[PDB]
PDB file of C-alpha atoms in Angstrom:
ATOM      1  CA  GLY A   1      15.037 -75.027  29.220  1.00  0.00           C
ATOM      2  CA  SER A   2      11.565 -73.610  28.729  1.00  0.00           C
ATOM      3  CA  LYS A   3       9.357 -71.586  26.375  1.00  0.00           C
ATOM      4  CA  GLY A   4       9.135 -68.961  29.133  1.00  0.00           C
ATOM      5  CA  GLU A   5      12.924 -68.497  28.830  1.00  0.00           C
ATOM      6  CA  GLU A   6      12.475 -67.208  25.263  1.00  0.00           C
ATOM      7  CA  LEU A   7      10.737 -64.098  26.594  1.00  0.00           C
ATOM      8  CA  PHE A   8      13.942 -63.002  28.360  1.00  0.00           C
ATOM      9  CA  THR A   9      16.574 -63.224  25.603  1.00  0.00           C
ATOM     10  CA  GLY A  10      16.604 -59.424  25.238  1.00  0.00           C
ATOM     11  CA  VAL A  11      15.976 -56.234  27.165  1.00  0.00           C
ATOM     12  CA  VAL A  12      12.568 -56.357  28.924  1.00  0.00           C
ATOM     13  CA  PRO A  13      10.681 -53.326  30.288  1.00  0.00           C
ATOM     14  CA  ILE A  14       9.664 -53.600  33.941  1.00  0.00           C
ATOM     15  CA  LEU A  15       6.952 -52.008  36.018  1.00  0.00           C
ATOM     16  CA  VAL A  16       6.740 -52.232  39.770  1.00  0.00           C
ATOM     17  CA  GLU A  17       3.750 -51.155  41.846  1.00  0.00           C
ATOM     18  CA  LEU A  18       3.618 -51.399  45.605  1.00  0.00           C
ATOM     19  CA  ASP A  19       0.887 -50.513  48.070  1.00  0.00           C
ATOM     20  CA  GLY A  20       2.222 -50.550  51.633  1.00  0.00           C
ATOM     21  CA  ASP A  21       1.120 -50.138  55.196  1.00  0.00           C
ATOM     22  CA  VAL A  22       3.692 -50.050  57.969  1.00  0.00           C
ATOM     23  CA  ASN A  23       2.488 -49.499  61.560  1.00  0.00           C
ATOM     24  CA  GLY A  24      -0.528 -47.822  59.983  1.00  0.00           C
ATOM     25  CA  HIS A  25       1.584 -45.435  57.817  1.00  0.00           C
ATOM     26  CA  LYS A  26       0.217 -45.870  54.276  1.00  0.00           C
ATOM     27  CA  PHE A  27       2.392 -45.349  51.190  1.00  0.00           C
ATOM     28  CA  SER A  28       2.626 -46.196  47.462  1.00  0.00           C
ATOM     29  CA  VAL A  29       5.690 -46.725  45.245  1.00  0.00           C
ATOM     30  CA  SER A  30       5.917 -46.900  41.500  1.00  0.00           C
ATOM     31  CA  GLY A  31       9.011 -48.180  39.700  1.00  0.00           C
ATOM     32  CA  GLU A  32      10.120 -48.371  36.091  1.00  0.00           C
ATOM     33  CA  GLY A  33      13.166 -49.778  34.392  1.00  0.00           C
ATOM     34  CA  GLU A  34      14.378 -52.750  32.497  1.00  0.00           C
ATOM     35  CA  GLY A  35      15.949 -56.125  32.830  1.00  0.00           C
ATOM     36  CA  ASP A  36      18.426 -58.045  30.701  1.00  0.00           C
ATOM     37  CA  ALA A  37      18.514 -61.634  31.925  1.00  0.00           C
ATOM     38  CA  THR A  38      21.356 -62.536  29.543  1.00  0.00           C
ATOM     39  CA  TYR A  39      23.614 -60.598  31.904  1.00  0.00           C
ATOM     40  CA  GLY A  40      21.531 -60.946  35.099  1.00  0.00           C
ATOM     41  CA  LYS A  41      21.178 -57.184  35.004  1.00  0.00           C
ATOM     42  CA  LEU A  42      18.387 -54.989  36.485  1.00  0.00           C
ATOM     43  CA  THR A  43      18.099 -51.208  36.339  1.00  0.00           C
ATOM     44  CA  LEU A  44      15.146 -49.659  38.168  1.00  0.00           C
ATOM     45  CA  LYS A  45      14.033 -46.307  39.521  1.00  0.00           C
ATOM     46  CA  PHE A  46      11.372 -46.192  42.248  1.00  0.00           C
ATOM     47  CA  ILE A  47       9.358 -43.114  43.250  1.00  0.00           C
ATOM     48  CA  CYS A  48       7.261 -42.743  46.424  1.00  0.00           C
ATOM     49  CA  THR A  49       4.011 -41.292  45.043  1.00  0.00           C
ATOM     50  CA  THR A  50       2.511 -40.462  48.474  1.00  0.00           C
ATOM     51  CA  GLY A  51       5.263 -38.113  49.666  1.00  0.00           C
ATOM     52  CA  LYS A  52       8.007 -39.188  52.072  1.00  0.00           C
ATOM     53  CA  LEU A  53       8.674 -42.900  52.444  1.00  0.00           C
ATOM     54  CA  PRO A  54       8.034 -43.908  56.112  1.00  0.00           C
ATOM     55  CA  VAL A  55      10.648 -46.700  56.050  1.00  0.00           C
ATOM     56  CA  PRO A  56      14.206 -46.738  54.698  1.00  0.00           C
ATOM     57  CA  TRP A  57      14.504 -47.512  50.970  1.00  0.00           C
ATOM     58  CA  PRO A  58      16.958 -50.398  51.519  1.00  0.00           C
ATOM     59  CA  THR A  59      14.366 -52.352  53.554  1.00  0.00           C
ATOM     60  CA  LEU A  60      12.223 -52.612  50.390  1.00  0.00           C
ATOM     61  CA  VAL A  61      14.853 -53.752  47.883  1.00  0.00           C
ATOM     62  CA  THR A  62      14.049 -57.491  48.085  1.00  0.00           C
ATOM     63  CA  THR A  63      10.344 -56.735  47.775  1.00  0.00           C
ATOM     64  CA  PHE A  64      10.734 -54.541  44.678  1.00  0.00           C
ATOM     65  CA  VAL A  66      11.822 -60.046  39.928  1.00  0.00           C
ATOM     66  CA  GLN A  67      14.071 -63.084  40.110  1.00  0.00           C
ATOM     67  CA  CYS A  68      13.076 -64.090  36.564  1.00  0.00           C
ATOM     68  CA  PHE A  69      15.868 -61.697  35.490  1.00  0.00           C
ATOM     69  CA  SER A  70      18.563 -63.858  37.152  1.00  0.00           C
ATOM     70  CA  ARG A  71      21.250 -65.184  34.830  1.00  0.00           C
ATOM     71  CA  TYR A  72      21.123 -68.949  34.869  1.00  0.00           C
ATOM     72  CA  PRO A  73      24.321 -70.428  33.422  1.00  0.00           C
ATOM     73  CA  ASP A  74      23.666 -72.687  30.410  1.00  0.00           C
ATOM     74  CA  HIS A  75      24.311 -75.880  32.361  1.00  0.00           C
ATOM     75  CA  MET A  76      21.743 -74.765  34.933  1.00  0.00           C
ATOM     76  CA  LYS A  77      18.926 -73.590  32.718  1.00  0.00           C
ATOM     77  CA  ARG A  78      16.678 -76.590  33.495  1.00  0.00           C
ATOM     78  CA  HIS A  79      16.556 -75.237  37.081  1.00  0.00           C
ATOM     79  CA  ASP A  80      15.091 -71.797  36.295  1.00  0.00           C
ATOM     80  CA  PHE A  81      11.600 -71.898  37.824  1.00  0.00           C
ATOM     81  CA  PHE A  82      10.973 -68.157  37.479  1.00  0.00           C
ATOM     82  CA  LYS A  83      11.190 -67.877  33.708  1.00  0.00           C
ATOM     83  CA  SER A  84       9.426 -71.221  33.160  1.00  0.00           C
ATOM     84  CA  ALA A  85       6.332 -69.810  34.915  1.00  0.00           C
ATOM     85  CA  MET A  86       6.084 -67.037  32.300  1.00  0.00           C
ATOM     86  CA  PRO A  87       4.140 -65.367  30.750  1.00  0.00           C
ATOM     87  CA  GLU A  88       1.316 -66.374  33.108  1.00  0.00           C
ATOM     88  CA  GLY A  89       3.581 -65.675  36.040  1.00  0.00           C
ATOM     89  CA  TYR A  90       3.901 -66.499  39.701  1.00  0.00           C
ATOM     90  CA  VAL A  91       2.826 -65.334  43.097  1.00  0.00           C
ATOM     91  CA  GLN A  92       5.648 -64.464  45.457  1.00  0.00           C
ATOM     92  CA  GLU A  93       4.947 -64.351  49.192  1.00  0.00           C
ATOM     93  CA  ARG A  94       7.342 -63.404  51.958  1.00  0.00           C
ATOM     94  CA  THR A  95       7.670 -62.880  55.624  1.00  0.00           C
ATOM     95  CA  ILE A  96      10.518 -60.550  56.468  1.00  0.00           C
ATOM     96  CA  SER A  97      11.538 -60.448  60.106  1.00  0.00           C
ATOM     97  CA  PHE A  98      13.766 -57.610  61.297  1.00  0.00           C
ATOM     98  CA  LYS A  99      15.913 -58.642  64.273  1.00  0.00           C
ATOM     99  CA  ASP A 100      14.397 -57.209  67.457  1.00  0.00           C
ATOM    100  CA  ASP A 101      11.927 -55.100  65.513  1.00  0.00           C
ATOM    101  CA  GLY A 102       8.804 -55.501  63.412  1.00  0.00           C
ATOM    102  CA  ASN A 103       8.095 -57.610  60.303  1.00  0.00           C
ATOM    103  CA  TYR A 104       6.851 -57.207  56.737  1.00  0.00           C
ATOM    104  CA  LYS A 105       4.416 -59.542  55.066  1.00  0.00           C
ATOM    105  CA  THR A 106       4.322 -59.324  51.301  1.00  0.00           C
ATOM    106  CA  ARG A 107       2.292 -60.755  48.462  1.00  0.00           C
ATOM    107  CA  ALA A 108       3.276 -60.039  44.883  1.00  0.00           C
ATOM    108  CA  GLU A 109       2.141 -61.146  41.471  1.00  0.00           C
ATOM    109  CA  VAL A 110       4.828 -61.214  38.833  1.00  0.00           C
ATOM    110  CA  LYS A 111       3.657 -61.621  35.250  1.00  0.00           C
ATOM    111  CA  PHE A 112       3.782 -60.190  31.747  1.00  0.00           C
ATOM    112  CA  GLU A 113       1.337 -57.532  30.709  1.00  0.00           C
ATOM    113  CA  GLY A 114       1.871 -57.324  26.964  1.00  0.00           C
ATOM    114  CA  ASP A 115       5.654 -57.078  26.512  1.00  0.00           C
ATOM    115  CA  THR A 116       6.154 -55.618  30.044  1.00  0.00           C
ATOM    116  CA  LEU A 117       7.218 -57.631  33.096  1.00  0.00           C
ATOM    117  CA  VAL A 118       5.027 -56.407  35.953  1.00  0.00           C
ATOM    118  CA  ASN A 119       5.559 -56.815  39.690  1.00  0.00           C
ATOM    119  CA  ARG A 120       2.498 -55.762  41.701  1.00  0.00           C
ATOM    120  CA  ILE A 121       2.931 -55.878  45.453  1.00  0.00           C
ATOM    121  CA  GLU A 122       0.911 -55.437  48.608  1.00  0.00           C
ATOM    122  CA  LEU A 123       2.963 -55.015  51.796  1.00  0.00           C
ATOM    123  CA  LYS A 124       1.876 -55.125  55.446  1.00  0.00           C
ATOM    124  CA  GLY A 125       4.256 -54.155  58.249  1.00  0.00           C
ATOM    125  CA  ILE A 126       3.573 -54.424  61.997  1.00  0.00           C
ATOM    126  CA  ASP A 127       5.233 -54.318  65.398  1.00  0.00           C
ATOM    127  CA  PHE A 128       7.871 -51.759  64.524  1.00  0.00           C
ATOM    128  CA  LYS A 129       9.546 -49.793  67.251  1.00  0.00           C
ATOM    129  CA  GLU A 130       8.789 -46.093  66.659  1.00  0.00           C
ATOM    130  CA  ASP A 131      12.439 -45.156  67.134  1.00  0.00           C
ATOM    131  CA  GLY A 132      13.883 -48.440  65.971  1.00  0.00           C
ATOM    132  CA  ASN A 133      16.306 -48.675  63.062  1.00  0.00           C
ATOM    133  CA  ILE A 134      13.482 -48.856  60.506  1.00  0.00           C
ATOM    134  CA  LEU A 135      10.891 -46.225  61.492  1.00  0.00           C
ATOM    135  CA  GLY A 136      13.763 -44.113  62.912  1.00  0.00           C
ATOM    136  CA  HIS A 137      15.571 -44.253  59.570  1.00  0.00           C
ATOM    137  CA  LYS A 138      18.885 -45.448  60.996  1.00  0.00           C
ATOM    138  CA  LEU A 139      19.927 -47.602  57.988  1.00  0.00           C
ATOM    139  CA  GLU A 140      22.803 -46.542  55.806  1.00  0.00           C
ATOM    140  CA  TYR A 141      21.804 -45.946  52.202  1.00  0.00           C
ATOM    141  CA  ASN A 142      23.606 -48.858  50.582  1.00  0.00           C
ATOM    142  CA  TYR A 143      23.198 -52.592  50.083  1.00  0.00           C
ATOM    143  CA  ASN A 144      25.173 -55.782  50.675  1.00  0.00           C
ATOM    144  CA  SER A 145      25.714 -58.798  48.411  1.00  0.00           C
ATOM    145  CA  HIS A 146      23.815 -61.975  49.305  1.00  0.00           C
ATOM    146  CA  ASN A 147      23.334 -65.594  48.395  1.00  0.00           C
ATOM    147  CA  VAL A 148      19.780 -66.795  48.230  1.00  0.00           C
ATOM    148  CA  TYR A 149      19.272 -70.608  48.472  1.00  0.00           C
ATOM    149  CA  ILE A 150      16.370 -71.969  46.441  1.00  0.00           C
ATOM    150  CA  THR A 151      14.712 -75.316  46.850  1.00  0.00           C
ATOM    151  CA  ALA A 152      11.741 -77.063  45.211  1.00  0.00           C
ATOM    152  CA  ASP A 153       8.289 -77.104  46.819  1.00  0.00           C
ATOM    153  CA  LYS A 154       6.691 -79.888  44.864  1.00  0.00           C
ATOM    154  CA  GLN A 155       3.321 -79.824  46.632  1.00  0.00           C
ATOM    155  CA  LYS A 156       2.775 -76.218  45.673  1.00  0.00           C
ATOM    156  CA  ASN A 157       4.375 -76.862  42.289  1.00  0.00           C
ATOM    157  CA  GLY A 158       6.771 -74.035  43.104  1.00  0.00           C
ATOM    158  CA  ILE A 159       9.819 -73.067  45.122  1.00  0.00           C
ATOM    159  CA  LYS A 160      10.767 -71.692  48.455  1.00  0.00           C
ATOM    160  CA  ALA A 161      13.778 -69.774  49.749  1.00  0.00           C
ATOM    161  CA  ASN A 162      15.326 -68.822  53.069  1.00  0.00           C
ATOM    162  CA  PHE A 163      17.945 -66.108  53.483  1.00  0.00           C
ATOM    163  CA  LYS A 164      19.154 -63.298  55.708  1.00  0.00           C
ATOM    164  CA  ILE A 165      19.596 -59.808  54.403  1.00  0.00           C
ATOM    165  CA  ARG A 166      22.336 -57.763  56.158  1.00  0.00           C
ATOM    166  CA  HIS A 167      21.388 -54.069  56.518  1.00  0.00           C
ATOM    167  CA  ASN A 168      24.234 -51.694  57.509  1.00  0.00           C
ATOM    168  CA  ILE A 169      23.269 -49.430  60.450  1.00  0.00           C
ATOM    169  CA  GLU A 170      24.646 -45.904  60.800  1.00  0.00           C
ATOM    170  CA  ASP A 171      26.152 -46.587  64.266  1.00  0.00           C
ATOM    171  CA  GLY A 172      28.294 -49.385  62.758  1.00  0.00           C
ATOM    172  CA  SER A 173      26.162 -52.392  63.533  1.00  0.00           C
ATOM    173  CA  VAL A 174      24.474 -54.697  61.044  1.00  0.00           C
ATOM    174  CA  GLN A 175      20.775 -55.579  61.391  1.00  0.00           C
ATOM    175  CA  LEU A 176      19.588 -58.908  59.973  1.00  0.00           C
ATOM    176  CA  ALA A 177      16.355 -59.128  58.000  1.00  0.00           C
ATOM    177  CA  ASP A 178      15.256 -62.782  57.941  1.00  0.00           C
ATOM    178  CA  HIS A 179      13.411 -63.678  54.719  1.00  0.00           C
ATOM    179  CA  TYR A 180      11.034 -66.608  54.300  1.00  0.00           C
ATOM    180  CA  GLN A 181       9.804 -66.889  50.697  1.00  0.00           C
ATOM    181  CA  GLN A 182       7.343 -69.024  48.726  1.00  0.00           C
ATOM    182  CA  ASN A 183       6.627 -68.874  44.983  1.00  0.00           C
ATOM    183  CA  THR A 184       3.778 -70.629  43.179  1.00  0.00           C
ATOM    184  CA  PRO A 185       2.792 -70.441  39.534  1.00  0.00           C
ATOM    185  CA  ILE A 186      -0.335 -68.534  38.543  1.00  0.00           C
ATOM    186  CA  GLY A 187      -1.010 -70.679  35.465  1.00  0.00           C
ATOM    187  CA  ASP A 188      -1.838 -74.384  35.328  1.00  0.00           C
ATOM    188  CA  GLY A 189       0.844 -75.455  32.833  1.00  0.00           C
ATOM    189  CA  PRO A 190       4.020 -77.385  33.686  1.00  0.00           C
ATOM    190  CA  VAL A 191       6.924 -75.511  35.232  1.00  0.00           C
ATOM    191  CA  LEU A 192      10.566 -76.368  35.896  1.00  0.00           C
ATOM    192  CA  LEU A 193      11.213 -77.403  39.511  1.00  0.00           C
ATOM    193  CA  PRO A 194      14.843 -76.946  40.474  1.00  0.00           C
ATOM    194  CA  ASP A 195      17.441 -78.929  42.313  1.00  0.00           C
ATOM    195  CA  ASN A 196      18.869 -77.043  45.258  1.00  0.00           C
ATOM    196  CA  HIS A 197      20.910 -74.042  44.123  1.00  0.00           C
ATOM    197  CA  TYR A 198      21.458 -70.407  45.055  1.00  0.00           C
ATOM    198  CA  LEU A 199      21.251 -66.919  43.517  1.00  0.00           C
ATOM    199  CA  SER A 200      24.242 -64.664  43.962  1.00  0.00           C
ATOM    200  CA  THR A 201      23.149 -61.058  44.130  1.00  0.00           C
ATOM    201  CA  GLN A 202      24.808 -57.649  44.226  1.00  0.00           C
ATOM    202  CA  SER A 203      23.048 -54.283  44.348  1.00  0.00           C
ATOM    203  CA  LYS A 204      24.073 -50.626  44.126  1.00  0.00           C
ATOM    204  CA  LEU A 205      21.711 -47.926  45.422  1.00  0.00           C
ATOM    205  CA  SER A 206      21.952 -44.340  44.196  1.00  0.00           C
ATOM    206  CA  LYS A 207      20.010 -41.121  43.674  1.00  0.00           C
ATOM    207  CA  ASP A 208      18.895 -39.139  40.637  1.00  0.00           C
ATOM    208  CA  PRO A 209      20.338 -35.641  41.132  1.00  0.00           C
ATOM    209  CA  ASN A 210      17.426 -34.096  39.183  1.00  0.00           C
ATOM    210  CA  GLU A 211      14.663 -35.878  41.086  1.00  0.00           C
ATOM    211  CA  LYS A 212      12.745 -33.921  43.733  1.00  0.00           C
ATOM    212  CA  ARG A 213      10.500 -36.754  45.005  1.00  0.00           C
ATOM    213  CA  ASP A 214      11.590 -39.414  47.511  1.00  0.00           C
ATOM    214  CA  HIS A 215      13.121 -42.117  45.324  1.00  0.00           C
ATOM    215  CA  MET A 216      15.682 -44.911  44.860  1.00  0.00           C
ATOM    216  CA  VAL A 217      17.780 -45.834  41.855  1.00  0.00           C
ATOM    217  CA  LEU A 218      18.705 -49.544  41.798  1.00  0.00           C
ATOM    218  CA  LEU A 219      21.359 -51.385  39.771  1.00  0.00           C
ATOM    219  CA  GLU A 220      21.468 -55.095  40.448  1.00  0.00           C
ATOM    220  CA  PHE A 221      23.226 -58.200  39.129  1.00  0.00           C
ATOM    221  CA  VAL A 222      21.967 -61.679  39.955  1.00  0.00           C
ATOM    222  CA  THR A 223      23.627 -64.978  38.925  1.00  0.00           C
ATOM    223  CA  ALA A 224      22.575 -68.549  39.677  1.00  0.00           C
ATOM    224  CA  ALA A 225      25.232 -70.934  41.010  1.00  0.00           C
ATOM    225  CA  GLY A 226      25.584 -74.018  43.222  1.00  0.00           C
ATOM    226  CA  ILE A 227      25.165 -76.743  40.632  1.00  0.00           C
ATOM    227  CA  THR A 228      28.259 -78.483  39.197  1.00  0.00           C
ATOM    228  CA  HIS A 229      28.614 -78.774  35.410  1.00  0.00           C
TER     229      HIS A 229
ATOM    230  CA  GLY B   1      33.614 -38.704  58.703  1.00  0.00           C
ATOM    231  CA  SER B   2      34.481 -36.230  55.935  1.00  0.00           C
ATOM    232  CA  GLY B   3      37.316 -36.078  53.416  1.00  0.00           C
ATOM    233  CA  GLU B   4      39.147 -33.120  51.865  1.00  0.00           C
ATOM    234  CA  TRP B   5      37.957 -30.540  49.410  1.00  0.00           C
ATOM    235  CA  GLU B   6      38.494 -31.504  45.764  1.00  0.00           C
ATOM    236  CA  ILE B   7      38.092 -29.355  42.689  1.00  0.00           C
ATOM    237  CA  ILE B   8      35.170 -30.322  40.477  1.00  0.00           C
ATOM    238  CA  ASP B   9      34.132 -29.085  37.020  1.00  0.00           C
ATOM    239  CA  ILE B  10      31.413 -26.501  36.436  1.00  0.00           C
ATOM    240  CA  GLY B  11      29.354 -28.714  34.140  1.00  0.00           C
ATOM    241  CA  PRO B  12      25.545 -29.273  34.261  1.00  0.00           C
ATOM    242  CA  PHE B  13      25.635 -31.155  37.618  1.00  0.00           C
ATOM    243  CA  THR B  14      27.381 -28.225  39.270  1.00  0.00           C
ATOM    244  CA  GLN B  15      25.231 -25.561  37.491  1.00  0.00           C
ATOM    245  CA  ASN B  16      22.162 -27.386  38.803  1.00  0.00           C
ATOM    246  CA  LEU B  17      23.548 -27.252  42.311  1.00  0.00           C
ATOM    247  CA  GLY B  18      23.852 -23.494  41.763  1.00  0.00           C
ATOM    248  CA  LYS B  19      20.242 -23.339  40.555  1.00  0.00           C
ATOM    249  CA  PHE B  20      19.161 -25.262  43.658  1.00  0.00           C
ATOM    250  CA  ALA B  21      20.991 -22.857  45.974  1.00  0.00           C
ATOM    251  CA  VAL B  22      19.358 -19.818  44.392  1.00  0.00           C
ATOM    252  CA  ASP B  23      15.868 -21.387  44.478  1.00  0.00           C
ATOM    253  CA  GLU B  24      16.308 -22.254  48.171  1.00  0.00           C
ATOM    254  CA  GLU B  25      17.624 -18.781  49.010  1.00  0.00           C
ATOM    255  CA  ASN B  26      14.655 -17.311  47.149  1.00  0.00           C
ATOM    256  CA  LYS B  27      12.346 -19.113  49.630  1.00  0.00           C
ATOM    257  CA  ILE B  28      13.916 -17.256  52.617  1.00  0.00           C
ATOM    258  CA  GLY B  29      13.848 -13.685  51.222  1.00  0.00           C
ATOM    259  CA  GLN B  30      16.599 -11.862  53.151  1.00  0.00           C
ATOM    260  CA  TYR B  31      17.825 -10.795  49.735  1.00  0.00           C
ATOM    261  CA  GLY B  32      15.585  -9.679  46.891  1.00  0.00           C
ATOM    262  CA  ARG B  33      14.451 -12.271  44.332  1.00  0.00           C
ATOM    263  CA  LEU B  34      17.647 -13.639  42.788  1.00  0.00           C
ATOM    264  CA  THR B  35      18.027 -14.867  39.229  1.00  0.00           C
ATOM    265  CA  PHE B  36      20.538 -17.644  38.630  1.00  0.00           C
ATOM    266  CA  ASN B  37      23.306 -16.929  36.136  1.00  0.00           C
ATOM    267  CA  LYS B  38      26.172 -19.386  36.558  1.00  0.00           C
ATOM    268  CA  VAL B  39      28.513 -21.267  38.804  1.00  0.00           C
ATOM    269  CA  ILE B  40      32.137 -20.185  38.253  1.00  0.00           C
ATOM    270  CA  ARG B  41      35.445 -21.782  39.197  1.00  0.00           C
ATOM    271  CA  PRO B  42      36.531 -22.935  41.620  1.00  0.00           C
ATOM    272  CA  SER B  43      33.804 -25.363  42.667  1.00  0.00           C
ATOM    273  CA  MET B  44      34.682 -27.961  45.214  1.00  0.00           C
ATOM    274  CA  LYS B  45      33.213 -30.909  47.054  1.00  0.00           C
ATOM    275  CA  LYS B  46      34.106 -33.094  49.977  1.00  0.00           C
ATOM    276  CA  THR B  47      32.916 -36.643  50.578  1.00  0.00           C
ATOM    277  CA  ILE B  48      30.936 -37.321  53.731  1.00  0.00           C
ATOM    278  CA  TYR B  49      31.207 -40.733  55.379  1.00  0.00           C
ATOM    279  CA  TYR B  50      29.052 -42.595  57.839  1.00  0.00           C
ATOM    280  CA  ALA B  51      30.529 -42.234  61.340  1.00  0.00           C
ATOM    281  CA  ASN B  52      31.631 -45.808  61.836  1.00  0.00           C
ATOM    282  CA  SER B  53      34.366 -48.295  60.940  1.00  0.00           C
ATOM    283  CA  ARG B  54      32.799 -49.198  57.587  1.00  0.00           C
ATOM    284  CA  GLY B  55      33.122 -45.556  56.632  1.00  0.00           C
ATOM    285  CA  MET B  56      31.050 -45.801  53.479  1.00  0.00           C
ATOM    286  CA  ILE B  57      29.878 -42.730  51.557  1.00  0.00           C
ATOM    287  CA  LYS B  58      26.970 -40.945  53.217  1.00  0.00           C
ATOM    288  CA  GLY B  59      26.856 -38.042  50.820  1.00  0.00           C
ATOM    289  CA  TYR B  60      28.754 -34.899  49.843  1.00  0.00           C
ATOM    290  CA  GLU B  61      29.203 -31.275  50.697  1.00  0.00           C
ATOM    291  CA  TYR B  62      29.633 -28.538  48.116  1.00  0.00           C
ATOM    292  CA  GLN B  63      31.133 -25.064  48.192  1.00  0.00           C
ATOM    293  CA  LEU B  64      30.204 -23.004  45.150  1.00  0.00           C
ATOM    294  CA  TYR B  65      30.718 -19.508  43.780  1.00  0.00           C
ATOM    295  CA  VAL B  66      27.398 -18.545  42.231  1.00  0.00           C
ATOM    296  CA  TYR B  67      26.489 -15.577  40.085  1.00  0.00           C
ATOM    297  CA  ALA B  68      22.886 -14.546  40.512  1.00  0.00           C
ATOM    298  CA  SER B  69      21.434 -11.139  39.525  1.00  0.00           C
ATOM    299  CA  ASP B  70      24.975 -10.168  38.533  1.00  0.00           C
ATOM    300  CA  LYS B  71      26.300 -10.599  42.056  1.00  0.00           C
ATOM    301  CA  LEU B  72      28.704 -13.238  43.384  1.00  0.00           C
ATOM    302  CA  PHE B  73      27.568 -15.434  46.293  1.00  0.00           C
ATOM    303  CA  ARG B  74      29.131 -18.183  48.279  1.00  0.00           C
ATOM    304  CA  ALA B  75      26.784 -21.153  48.562  1.00  0.00           C
ATOM    305  CA  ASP B  76      27.316 -24.181  50.745  1.00  0.00           C
ATOM    306  CA  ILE B  77      25.176 -27.239  50.010  1.00  0.00           C
ATOM    307  CA  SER B  78      24.913 -30.572  51.835  1.00  0.00           C
ATOM    308  CA  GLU B  79      23.770 -33.782  50.108  1.00  0.00           C
ATOM    309  CA  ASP B  80      22.729 -36.591  52.513  1.00  0.00           C
ATOM    310  CA  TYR B  81      21.489 -39.815  50.888  1.00  0.00           C
ATOM    311  CA  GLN B  82      20.087 -41.278  54.050  1.00  0.00           C
ATOM    312  CA  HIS B  83      17.413 -38.640  54.669  1.00  0.00           C
ATOM    313  CA  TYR B  84      14.803 -37.031  52.441  1.00  0.00           C
ATOM    314  CA  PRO B  85      15.079 -34.313  51.222  1.00  0.00           C
ATOM    315  CA  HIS B  86      18.707 -34.964  50.451  1.00  0.00           C
ATOM    316  CA  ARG B  87      19.848 -31.460  49.405  1.00  0.00           C
ATOM    317  CA  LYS B  88      19.890 -28.696  51.950  1.00  0.00           C
ATOM    318  CA  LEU B  89      21.248 -25.147  51.624  1.00  0.00           C
ATOM    319  CA  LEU B  90      23.531 -24.680  54.604  1.00  0.00           C
ATOM    320  CA  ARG B  91      24.802 -21.180  53.835  1.00  0.00           C
ATOM    321  CA  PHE B  92      24.305 -18.524  51.185  1.00  0.00           C
ATOM    322  CA  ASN B  93      26.228 -15.266  51.650  1.00  0.00           C
ATOM    323  CA  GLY B  94      27.073 -12.320  49.405  1.00  0.00           C
ATOM    324  CA  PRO B  95      28.240 -10.344  47.695  1.00  0.00           C
ATOM    325  CA  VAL B  96      31.753 -11.803  48.137  1.00  0.00           C
ATOM    326  CA  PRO B  97      35.212 -11.102  46.689  1.00  0.00           C
ATOM    327  CA  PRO B  98      35.921 -12.858  43.354  1.00  0.00           C
ATOM    328  CA  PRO B  99      38.144 -15.920  43.737  1.00  0.00           C
TER     329      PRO B  99
END
């Protein structure tokens, strides 16, 4: 358990800000919503503020706050994300789309007042102009995944490896290979975890009254993989 | 893929679809400027599925009877979640016989 954990015992407002650049196409996204870590529950709405999003919304779901995961009581000593709070952590990823381009992301996740903020810069290169991504061939939905977490003692943080499965309209599934590293922003002690995983499930939807390009996200994340 | 027509209610969601149809039709101009009044029964929708073995929901299609400027129109609207903008006015014809 940690002092950081005490900041998540109720409903927490969330802001998400992303600046992106994919094959030179520049875009910005703002998101708002809230998280309730007691139930591993996230509710977020994202709006593309620069017009039409040049990549499919599902490809950005993992980039758009694992501190809202529900860690079962017997596992709470393994919750790095909340222990890094309020000072926060940096989350870096490489995301490799099978036989297409890749995203590189850097995010800072921290409290600003009572708000959990995720500020992201994203760089995408080597995408095929009529591939699944720039050609918008992904179904608008999202699969359930298990994300394995392990300690990275030398960076006083964690790392994760996982594959995201994106449904493709023609019936195939395209894998997005995620390599992730998280390191605390502050200098204080953090909880470093034994090996475990996060079990995720996400539902994507639309706001019928919204005229801008957007995504509504409902997500549940639960930690598992450690016996009690 | 696409399922069968099902009756839906004429609540706010449906009335807003009506409003959308009239606003879109107003952009073309083959009729004079229309003023939305109401969607009347029956309204119906069919589910649209991705064309593959998963067959998950891609969106919906709507067929509405819409009163605008005191005339009854048939409006067909498609909703496609994969591509922005999602709502498109497919057809808008009138006046038509009352259902």
